From Swiss-Prot:
Family named by the database record: Belongs to the RNA polymerase beta chain family.
The protein's assembly and partners: The RNAP catalytic core consists of 2 alpha, 1 beta, 1 beta' and 1 omega subunit. When a sigma factor is associated with the core the holoenzyme is formed, which can initiate transcription.
Species annotation: Caulobacter vibrioides (strain NA1000 / CB15N) (Caulobacter crescentus)
Protein name according to UniProt: DNA-directed RNA polymerase subunit beta
Recorded superkingdom: Bacteria
Amino acid sequence: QYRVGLLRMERAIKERMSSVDIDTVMPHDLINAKPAAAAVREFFGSSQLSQF
DNA sequence: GCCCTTAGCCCCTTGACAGGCGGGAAACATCGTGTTAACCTTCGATTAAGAGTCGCTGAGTCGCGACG
């Protein structure tokens, strides 16, 4: 599930890096963190394996 | 024992507030528009390790006969 979240984050970073230039760019400014923690939250929030 | 006189209770008249829903007038936070023009002109899941049956389609096999 973290690999799925990382694939989503990679898609987001690929969609966002085309707009923001890489030369003189603020570090880690295009990498998102919502789908990273959202995947583990769903895994521990309402997953069938983490049900109880 | 009954009638007259006076006191207490009930009722009426006025009223000086108090503020209180509510529209208006105003000061201030919404909600639908625009507008800008420097680069990519196919994104992506999701069953599919049981099970009884409804509704449609399209291939290979035969009859009936005509023309040599």
